[PDB]
């Protein structure tokens, strides 16, 4: 059936999605940060990436931004000038540099009226993140079931304390890729085709990596999978609870059949292996510890058993209860 679960999923979705009010205030903040950047560098561009831009944002989400500029202009100097302009405009935050890469982390706004807890990361020439955002955004436009599924999965992982990359578990971006991997390579018939492996895909090289994918979306047939949101979600929990083998296999978007061993890849950290679709040398689940994977798997298992429970009424609310 899944009819009652599907209705429940849409109810939670509507409550957890970013409201129009917040989306418009984030867009106002971006306009303001663009003004500050203009004052310091008229040639540079400020762009948004991540879930706000791909349309996969929950209420009260952080902002992910990137300054694009000529690569012959050195990034740390403009980063510093931008940072100083932001501080002078009443933003609070930190300027830092890991290796060669400068980063501004804004944690507050004291003047412009965007909040005491305005949270915004600003990277410099992070072109790959823009591209992986274009990808996720394309999938979001290809099937209306993607957005609510992702939001629910993210909300679930937050509630269960398995969405903490600094504490041994997995980034939200890692969960989005796990969803996508399920929708492309696991479910039958597929919800999505693999856009990177399309015969119509044109190579595009950016910072060493191929970021090409078929983006002519209006020529792609609709899915021949007709599952409700509830059934999709139950399938997803089931696959990562019982079928996926994290010790041996890699979540990937580079194989026609989605099959890849950690060994071929050289990924013996690698407790959980998710190959980024573009930056194929980057394991997105590298933050996942041995205990974190246990808890992640335990929660996939618990979600599966709840949706499979023969004891009615099924307490669906418990899917989003704080572990
Ligand atoms: O390993 C990573 C993680 C992050 N990213 C890039 O950073 C973006 C934001 O990474 P997040 O983990 O914040 O994704 P999110 O926006 O969906 O999660 P919430 O903040 O909503 O909790 C991602 O959408 C991707 O563009 C990477 O490219 N690689
Ligand atoms: Mg984010």
- Please state the domain extents for the chain: 1-17+143-323, 18-142
Strand order in the sheet with 101-109: 45-49, 63-68, 120-124, 101-109, 91-98
77 is in an annotated binding site: no
Residue 117 tokens read as: 């807890």
Residue 21 tokens read as: 């009010």
Is 51 a pocket residue for ligand 1 (Cβ < 6 Å)?
A: yes
The answer to whether 43 touches 81, Cβ cutoff 8 Å, is no
Fold agreement (1-17+143-323, 18-142): no
Could you please state the CATH topology (level 3) that the domain comprising 1-17+143-323 is classified under. Poly(a)-polymerase, middle domain (1.10.1410)
Resolution in A: 2.3
Elucidated via: X-ray
| Secondary structure element (H or E) that encloses residue 255, with its range | none
Using CA positions, which residue lies closest to atom 28 of ligand 1? Answer: 129
For CA atoms 109, 115, 117, 121, give the dihedral sign: negative
Residue 221 backbone phi and psi in degrees, to 5: -60, 150
Domain 18-142 in this protein, CATH class: alpha beta
What lies within 8 Å, CB to CB, of 14 at 6+ separation is none
- Closest among 132, 145, 210 to 173, alpha carbons compared: 132
Is 61 a pocket residue for ligand 1 (Cβ < 6 Å)?
A: yes
Using CA positions, which residue lies closest to atom 16 of ligand 1? Answer: 51
Residue 114 tokens read as: 């965007």
Spacing, Cα 311 to ligand 1 middle (Å): 37
What lies within 8 Å, CB to CB, of 189 at 6+ separation is 223, 224, 225
Is 133 a pocket residue for ligand 1 (Cβ < 6 Å)?
A: yes
What lies within 8 Å, CB to CB, of 23 at 6+ separation is 52, 57
The answer to whether 225 touches 190, Cβ cutoff 8 Å, is yes
| Secondary structure element (H or E) that encloses residue 97, with its range | strand 91-98
Could you tell me which residues are beta bridge partners of residue 96?
A: 103
The answer to whether 110 touches 57, Cβ cutoff 8 Å, is no
CA–CA gap between residue 78 and residue 83 (Å, rounded): 8
What lies within 8 Å, CB to CB, of 292 at 6+ separation is 162, 164, 167, 168, 169, 170, 271
Among 60, 64, 133, residue to substitute to test ligand 1 (most atoms within 8 Å of Cβ): 64
What single-letter DSSP state applies at residue 65? E
């Amino acid at each position: 059936s899944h009819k009652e679960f599907t209705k429940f999923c849409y109810e939670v979705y509507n409550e957890i999605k970013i409201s129009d009010k917040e989306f418009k205030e984030k867009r106002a903040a971006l306009d303001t940060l663009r003004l500050c950047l203009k004052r310091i560098s008229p040639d540079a561009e400020l762009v948004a990436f991540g879930s706000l831009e791909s349309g996969l944002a929950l209420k009260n989400s952080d902002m992910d931004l990137c300054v694009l500029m000529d690569s012959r202009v050195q990034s740390d100097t403009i980063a510093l000038q931008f940072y100083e302009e932001l501080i002078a405009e009443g933003f609070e935050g930190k300027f830092l540099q890991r290796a060669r890469i400068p980063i501004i982390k804004l944690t507050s706004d004291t003047k412009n009226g965007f909040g005491a807890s305005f949270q915004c990361d600003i990277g410099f020439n992070n072109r790959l993140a823009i591209h992986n955002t274009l990808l996720l955004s394309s999938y979001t436009k290809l099937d209306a079931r993607l957005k609510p599924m992702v939001l629910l999965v993210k909300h679930w992982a937050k509630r269960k304390q398995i969405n903490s990359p600094y504490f041994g578990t997995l980034s939200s971006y890692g969960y989005v890729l796990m969803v996508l991997y399920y929708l492309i390579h696991v479910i039958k018939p597929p919800v999505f085709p693999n856009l990177l492996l399309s015969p119509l895909k044109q190579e595009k090289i950016v910072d060493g990596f191929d970021v090409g994918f078929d983006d002519k979306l209006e020529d792609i047939p609709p899915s021949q999978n007709y599952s409700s949101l509830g059934s999709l979600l139950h399938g997803f929990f089931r696959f990562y609870a019982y079928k996926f083998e994290p010790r041996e296999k890699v979540v990937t978007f580079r194989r026609p059949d989605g099959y890849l061993t950690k060994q071929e890849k050289g990924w013996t950290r690698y407790i959980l292996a998710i190959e980024d679709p573009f930056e194929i040398s980057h394991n997105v689940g590298r933050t996942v510890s041995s205990s974190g994977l246990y808890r992640i798997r335990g929660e996939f298992m618990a979600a599966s058993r709840l949706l499979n429970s023969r004891s009615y009424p099924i307490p669906y609310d418990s899917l989003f209860e704080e572990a």
